[PDB]
UniProtKB/Swiss-Prot annotation:
InterPro entries for this protein: Ribosome_recyc_fac, Ribosome_recyc_fac_dom, RRF_sf
Any GO molecular function: ribosomal large subunit binding
Gene transcribed to yield this protein: frr
Function as written in the Swiss-Prot or TrEMBL entry: Responsible for the release of ribosomes from messenger RNA at the termination of protein biosynthesis. May increase the efficiency of translation by recycling ribosomes from one round of translation to another.
Protein name, UniProt field: Ribosome-recycling factor
One GO CC term, this protein: cytoplasm
Lineage: Bacteria, Bacillati, Actinomycetota, Actinomycetes, Mycobacteriales
Amino acid sequence: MIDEALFDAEEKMEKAVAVARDDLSTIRTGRANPGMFSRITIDYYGAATPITQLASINVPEARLVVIKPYEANQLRAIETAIRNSDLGVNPTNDGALIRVAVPQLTEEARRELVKQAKHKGEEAKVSVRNIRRKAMEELHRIRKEGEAGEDEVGRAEKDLDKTTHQYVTQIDELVKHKEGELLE
């Protein structure tokens, strides 16, 4: 049915756009967020484990992160993972807390990250397009087989085209915004 193809495709695009927002969040910036720490993993009893699951990540000032590990025995293993990461960070030790001052990025690094953001956007747009294609070829099958009227299917095609472009644009705003986060 038109409905299933159309309503599910929309719902999937929303998820894809949501995934892209989260994905952009993982990029290092100025205006530190937790997301930049999300893909730092420690050895946690044999399982490669994100620090995000193992510590409460707080942002007091603009360029200062405060990380509180649930298990004090883990603190040194966490700080090292931060120290050995690709964040460009020199974390200090407080005892219960890890003090992470985040430096302003170099112009070279920020052109490389702007690059990273465009790519994550491109991936999500392609994903959105694939969702449209699957729903559109269902519409095409409905038409071919005469399971719905021609005018009916052509309105649904027009609707799907609109929905798709709205979500692609949303992804483009999402990148446009991370780009401006990175170039200030």
